[PDB]
Amino acid sequence: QAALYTHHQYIAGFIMTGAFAHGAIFFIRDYNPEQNKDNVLARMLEHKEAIISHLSWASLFLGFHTLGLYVHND
Amino acid sequence: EVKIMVEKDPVKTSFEKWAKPGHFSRTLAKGPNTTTWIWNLHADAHDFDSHTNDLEEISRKVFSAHFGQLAVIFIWLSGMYFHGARFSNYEAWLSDPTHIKPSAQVVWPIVGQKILNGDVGGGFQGIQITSGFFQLWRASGITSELQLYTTAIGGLIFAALMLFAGWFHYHKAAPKLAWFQNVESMLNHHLAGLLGLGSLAWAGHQVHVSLPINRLLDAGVDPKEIPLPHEFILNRDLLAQLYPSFSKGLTPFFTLNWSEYSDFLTFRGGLNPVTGGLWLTDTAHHHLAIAVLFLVAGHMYRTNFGIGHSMKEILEAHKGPFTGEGHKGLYEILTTSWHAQLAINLAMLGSLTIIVAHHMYAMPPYPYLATDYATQLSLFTHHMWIGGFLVVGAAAHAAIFMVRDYDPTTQYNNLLDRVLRHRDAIISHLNWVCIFLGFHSFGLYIHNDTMSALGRPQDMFSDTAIQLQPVFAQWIQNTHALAPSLTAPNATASTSLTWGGGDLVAVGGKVALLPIPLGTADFLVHHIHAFTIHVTVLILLKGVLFARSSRLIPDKANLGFRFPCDGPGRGGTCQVSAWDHVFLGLFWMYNAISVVIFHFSWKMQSDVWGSISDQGVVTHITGGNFAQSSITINGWLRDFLWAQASQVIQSYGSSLSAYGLLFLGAHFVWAFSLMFLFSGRGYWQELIESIVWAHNKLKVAPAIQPRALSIVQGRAVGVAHYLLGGIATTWAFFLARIISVG
Amino acid sequence: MFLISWRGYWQELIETLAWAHERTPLANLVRWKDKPVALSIVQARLVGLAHFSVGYIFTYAAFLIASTSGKFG
Amino acid sequence: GDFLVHHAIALGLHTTTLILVKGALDARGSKLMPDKKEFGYSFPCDGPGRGGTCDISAWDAFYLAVFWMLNTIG
Amino acid sequence: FNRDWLRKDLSVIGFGLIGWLAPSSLPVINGNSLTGLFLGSIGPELAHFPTGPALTSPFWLWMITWHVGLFIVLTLGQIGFKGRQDGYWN
Amino acid sequence: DVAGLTPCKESKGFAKRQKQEIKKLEGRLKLYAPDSAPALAINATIEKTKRRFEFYGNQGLLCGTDGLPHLIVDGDQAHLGEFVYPGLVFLYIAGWIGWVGRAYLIDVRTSKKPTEKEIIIDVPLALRIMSKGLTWPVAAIGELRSGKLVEKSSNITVSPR
Amino acid sequence: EKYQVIEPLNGDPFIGGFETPVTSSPLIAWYLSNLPAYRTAVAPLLRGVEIGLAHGYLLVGPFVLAGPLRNSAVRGEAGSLAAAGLVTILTMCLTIYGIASFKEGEASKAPSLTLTGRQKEADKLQTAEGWASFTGGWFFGGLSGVAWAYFLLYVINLPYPVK
């Protein structure tokens, strides 16, 4: 059971990294702004700074507070 | 002509430049356009060569900075003596040194940290110190806290004096360049007047203060009724009843009947059985002899009275057929470049500190030092790390000299030019020897791992298997064990109990020193040490020799000493600068010193340190498993890293819990360093751009534009955090383990 | 190792080793066809990542299986 | 303990996603490298100019996110 | 390369042999009542049994001392002879 | 009880931990003279532990299996003092700090050399900005409603798409 | 103006080498010039035979005194077979090296100029057929040397100190 769980979880993580890498490759090599004009993909590209900044905030908040609670308990 | 030359009031004492941060450089004096400026302000503050091209001003800055460092060290020492005077159990430890743990630091009761005030003994609670200051003060003859107080007050006075001296020699009377370039006078004064006279003075202290007080202490006299040192100096009959030769009173010294001083100027060797340290009579004779030697040696160079040596003429006269002009032009190098002197002195100081580390455990010079295993381990590890850092710094400053201070016109067909001209052969052969050593040591460890895992213990490299005996080291030990018999007939004992003879010194119920045996494991670990040292030397020497140019970038001198790269061309020029070579040599020195200290710790806990019973049975801290477990990497993982780390991780809820906390925190800092080491700069710059957008949306973006750390700064931060985490992890682990098992 | 030291050190070292091979007797008779070069930057990152991941996976798999099967509990 | 470790898991997921989405959305360009699309997916750097451009490609974002996914699955 | 890099003056080895036999073959009044060369000759005398090393016997120390002395004497003799033709000290 | 947690007043594990800590401190105490300063320190420790455990019991903390207070952060009225009340205090302090920092940045963007004002802080200006953080939420709401809090997207640098 | 033993490579300061006693001593240079690898006029087959003989003969020993069966009664046979297998693998190495490096019908690219400048004939070892002959001779000589070492050590049992 332990081996199966660890196996499929690591496989899933690698697969997710691959999915995001191929999304990046799509944007570089296959994304045409002419045909994708003001659709959902173009709107993601438009407010990407907001997305990245809010991900940064969520990561910072989680890391700070979880690490602080752990160090407090230690 | 050697004369005193100064300039009056060169720099006005004013706070005007305190308000201007980057005043020392033209680039930083404009202002902080970006955040990088702040970091640059701290990275160019002490690079005096970069501030100006004037060597006189650089020399003045260096002199005053040295005065400031001396003041800082005086403050630090005064603090140690103060904490010994008030927040210490020094007198209780004097009454019973074998059962009271030294402690000189007491925490405040604020957040439960008061648990750190452990029961060290003598009716005292505090942090158990491992600096060896208690034993040093015992050797010096200090018996009361009043003496520590007066020493601390004198230390504060000397710190103020050094601070004033720095101010005076920068702002009021600044020496000229001719004064600094008098290297012959400087050597004569630092040999005769600094080392020789200092050794003579310390011999005087020992003769008049340390020997009588310490021999009364060895006799069992309570320190309270031990007469004060000035009573020994004044009432010389009181001193003569301990050593009768004092009744002669300087007559033997001037009649050359020096043998009459054999009472307190001995050449015994070995250890004092009562304290486990060196005999202080031997130490006094040692210091007197080296004082005489240094005072003689300091009369070698010609300053202005004729009679002496011109070092320029000595150097120019040493050349041969295999070299060109030999040591021609090196006098100008070493009298006009501060970085060359810094490189030489750093290398020598690091090697000297390593010698100190090796020699202070084999001959413990202080009473009750060997049996204090925590102090021994701490001193060894501390001085090993200091020496390694200094050696790497010597490499760094040799590279800096090669980049900036090197002048090809005045260096033609000399030794430096010829070394530059066959650097390819040097680095080729050093690379080959590094590969050969790595294979025939670590591959031997891997062979042992594999045969142990395959169930073939007879195919391993051990004492019960194919044996690799260190016959040369064993022969050297045998020779040193028999030195008093034939080779040094005026010696009672050998140089150290580690050579041989079957003698075991056991202060209290512990073991001070005993003959250290060498076998296959010692062969393997010494060859591992050689491998690590040669690889570090390879990295550093390749950085120094190829700092100016290489087949890849023929104009690397124009790029500078501290630059990230030259671009992604030629396949990629990442880390081509000598600074990056120092950056990697820091990692390799870290590995070398780490393995050295691990070997020391395991060997001592396994074969030397232990407890002896009344019958005479000697049991060791680990149990003598180094000979059979150090041959295998799994043995290192299990019997050393896993077995001996049981105490740092179980230290919670006790006075050693701080060691576990810092163990984990150092692990954290190391892991944190990993991302500065692995990541780049564009990624973080773009993340910073997104964060800056977030701030601009709310009109809170700073005018000082946030920038990611430079590439070189990224590497510097990574290596700094890496070394801090690793070294602090080991520090916590050793201290917890050795306080628990000792 | 592949993630910390980046490229230039190894390119200079390989230059030195090429000189050494070309100047050594009985071995300069043997010649390479592809000029030896240090690994590229992207290749170095990928090789270091592969080593890191393989070590991660093997270390944790060994620990997991050994600690769950040594004590069936 | 389950609370703290699930929040650590959320931290790991959020940070790995931050790295991967940042690589995917900055793949076509950024303020440091506005013409990143012409250089492809996996290129070393853009040289030491403009302060330094190490790990400026989206492939380098994937490289940096593999460490975080390994940590999170660990 | 001129094929005479080690300018052959075969008198150097004989002069060094004489100048190292003279100091080593001296009855020193110190702990060594006899001379060290006689010890370095006794060593081989006790070690003439075929197929066996000295095994940490009192032979290695004398060997090392005597041969280091011989090597330094030979090197200094070579340097002294070949520095006169040159102007290293003149 | 809020996830099967007993109150710490009648929690046997909580009392067991009390007893164990007091017993450990007394065992450490037995090796010192009563009049000695270490004895006074250990007795102060014992009093501190006793008052700490009494305070934890008196506020109705929830102890789980064994004695360990557990915090409820779901908004329950009986546990507002664990996260909601200190949480609000934190929000007031953090918003204070951020708001006054933002105000200082605003007030130094109109200066002739703002960077010098950032590396060398105008202490009088900074202090009279800091004094304004007492009523920071009101100012934040006013700026949000008036439109002076958020910059328009047309005046913010963005990278090419 | 001193003697200056060390000189540039053939007097050329701009070639990447030096003239050292290690490089071109009369004894060292004589020794290296007469090694079978450097006897360019001799046929590659005989040079390969000599090289393989020497190498198999020296290779037999380590396998015999360090192999896994060094404590068994088949120690000699095991070591000899290990040496022969290493010789065979190195023969494959030489064959593939010759296949990759040299093409049939091409002239030799080995240096045909001496230090003096005699402009001798190019060495035929650096050719497809030359390397093929060298590899065949090396195989034969390696097997012969392994057999000879095994015969001297075990079949004949000559007295040797360590074996």
Ligand code: CLA
């Ligand atoms: C359905 C699955 C799938 C498919 C069809 C593809 C297909 C492709 N990918 Mg994608 N990818 C996937 C999954 C997939 N990938 C996953 C799961 C990941 C995350 C790890 C990625 C991450 C990824 C990146 C980051 C890139 C690609 C690229 C590519 C393209 C070229 C690949 C190449 O050169 O192969 C050649 C194969 C290799 C180089 C792999 C060599 C072996 C690797 C290093 C692992 C070896 C480990 C170890 C040494 C072996 C075990 C040792 C043992 C002792 C333990 C191709 C279109 C590239 C691309 O499009 O370029 C623009 C590119 O840059 N992929």
Ligand code: CLA
């Ligand atoms: C233990 C190791 C470690 C730690 C703590 C971090 C921490 C962080 N990384 Mg890094 N990282 C690491 C290893 C680590 N990383 C490694 C090995 C890799 C692979 C190369 C990366 C790759 C990586 C990438 C690619 C990214 C991060 C990001 C982040 C942030 C995630 C948010 C977070 O946790 O905020 C909480 C913050 C922390 C946990 C940092 C420590 C805070 C300390 C404890 C507080 C200060 C203490 C004290 C006052 C300082 C004293 C010093 C001195 C003044 C005396 C955070 C700064 C992401 C980021 O920056 O997004 C915002 C991001 O994009 N990291």
Ligand code: CLA
């Ligand atoms: C006997 C004469 C003498 C003595 C004792 C020293 C001693 C010292 N010199 Mg040297 N020096 C001398 C002559 C002497 N110097 C001469 C003649 C010159 C000119 C050619 C120099 C030029 C020189 C330079 C350029 C530098 C030194 C430095 C140092 C200090 C190195 C730190 C150290 O290990 O000290 C260990 C010992 C102590 C820390 C004890 C405290 C110092 C006491 C008070 C002795 C000071 C002796 C002083 C020279 C006497 C004149 C001062 C007097 C007017 C009050 C050391 C104190 C370096 C340094 O750190 O500068 C501060 C340095 O950079 N010296």
Ligand code: CLA
């Ligand atoms: C006698 C000792 C000595 C002296 C006088 C100097 C003097 C100098 N060095 Mg050298 N150096 C030394 C030892 C020494 N170094 C050693 C031992 C090393 C090996 C690590 C080096 C490695 C080295 C490099 C690689 C470089 C220098 C540079 C410099 C110049 C300083 C410019 C600068 O940025 O510093 C300002 C001061 C700092 C940057 C120090 C900041 C703090 C450090 C980085 C971390 C502190 C660690 C701390 C202990 C951690 C715990 C506390 C923490 C929790 C708060 C100056 C000429 C630089 C130079 O000349 O550039 C051209 C340069 O590039 N040195």
Ligand code: CLA
């Ligand atoms: C455990 C990790 C590790 C290992 C094994 C190595 C290995 C090596 N490093 Mg690296 N290095 C590392 C971590 C490591 N490094 C890290 C973290 C850093 C960052 C500071 C560096 C930085 C660094 C630099 C800057 C330099 C090296 C150098 C070296 C070499 C040492 C000498 C040599 O080649 O012979 C010894 C080789 C080994 C010990 C490798 C293992 C070989 C084993 C014993 C035998 C296995 C073979 C076996 C038959 C299996 C065959 C496989 C086959 C079936 C495919 C070697 C390639 C130096 C170099 O170039 O060499 C001179 C050099 O200059 N490294």
Ligand code: CLA
């Ligand atoms: C996974 C494949 C594999 C296999 C099947 C083997 C098999 C073997 N190895 Mg291992 N080995 C391997 C991989 C492998 N190895 C790898 C990857 C390494 C590097 C880490 C090693 C490193 C290694 C060492 C260091 C040693 C072995 C030895 C041995 C032999 C065990 C002792 C024995 O047979 O008695 C004694 C041996 C014999 C009686 C006969 C050996 C000689 C025969 C004739 C070899 C066949 C030669 C043949 C002409 C060519 C065939 C291959 C060719 C087509 C490439 C055995 C044949 C031991 C040995 O004896 O080496 C020779 C030994 O010391 N191996």
